[PDB]
């Protein structure tokens with residue numbers, strides 16, 4: 317809060333030199349880099365200026381605050397006691413930066429455009445007065461959608477669904493959280509050598525077999541939480557586009573959320589987390605393809621249990637209810 321800092325504050329030379337672009341959205345850009353031998357993901361969002369960026373207006377600082385707040389609150393659950401989870405992406409730091417875009421990041425941007433292609437404008441039009449928010453996250457891996465063909469088996473699917481359900485339950489209990497946009501691009505996966513992952517829900521600790529993967533939830537655009545009756549949420553009550561998509565169950569979920577909440581987005585309706593978990597379970601059964609099919613009895617029972625989850629879970633009121641009551645987790 318000593319005013320904006322230069323890019324070099326967050327990205328000193330060596331850290332800048334090691335940046336590779338890994339993601340993007342209308343919001344801006346995501347780079348992976350290394351510092352102290354450890355990968356991090358850097359999300360860079362232009363704020364406060366008059367230029368369209370990627371077709372949209374820039375957010376003001378007041379408008380970017382919700383993202384910052386929610387990202388921090390969910391990250392801090394990894395250090396709490398009664399409601400503890402590491403299943404949200406870890407937030408290392410947030411800065412407000414001022415300057416034109418670093419040439420080294422443009423070099424990385426270009427490399428990505430040449431190899432993967434981009435929907436974004438080349439971010440080379442910013443002036444030396446431009447402000448940005450730079451969010452530094454732990455590196456969370458690769459999204460479930462990109463891993464459509466890369467997972468081992470439905471046992472891995474069960475671990476992912478259990479991890480997601482537990483994380484959402486913990487956040488429900490602590491923060492009256494709803495993610496509200498948990499499509500399969502927002503579930504990150506990375507290898508872990510831990511066999512069991514740990515969480516605590518309202519003071520009761522348990523474990524989840526990892527199947528070698530750690531899940532991290534990202535992207536709080538539409539998310540809602542509260543502390544001491546102060547609610548932070550994205551008011552989409554007047555959005556048209558959001559409720560008119562087609563071609564994927566994802567777009568039904570927006571409509572189903574609006575039905576559940578009567579188009580009142582400030583309220584708490586943890587059923588929305590159940591809807592997203594159902595959409596994810598649907599992806600696991602219908603769009604994911606696994607290296608090893610369920611060819612044995614124990615594996616076959618896992619398949620049947622995930623199908624039973626799919627068919628029953630919409631009769632639960634929250635992620636907390638699913639976690640605590642559903643047979644899949646017993």
Ligand SMILES: O=C(Nc1ccc2n[nH]c(-c3ccncc3)c2c1)[C@@H]1CCN(CC(=O)N2CCN(c3ccc(-c4ncccn4)cc3)CC2)C1
Pocket residue numbers: 338339340341346357359405432433434435436453454455456457458459501504534535
């Ligand atoms: O954007 C992506 N990943 C994201 C996003 C946000 C993130 N926030 N935080 C993280 C994060 C990651 C790891 N650890 C911690 C945090 C994010 C990762 C994925 C990877 C890339 N992706 C799709 C993509 O970038 N495409 C590029 C190519 N493409 C495409 C190509 C050309 C055109 C085009 N349009 C107009 C003119 C010319 N070409 C449009 C789209 C569609 C797919 C989804």
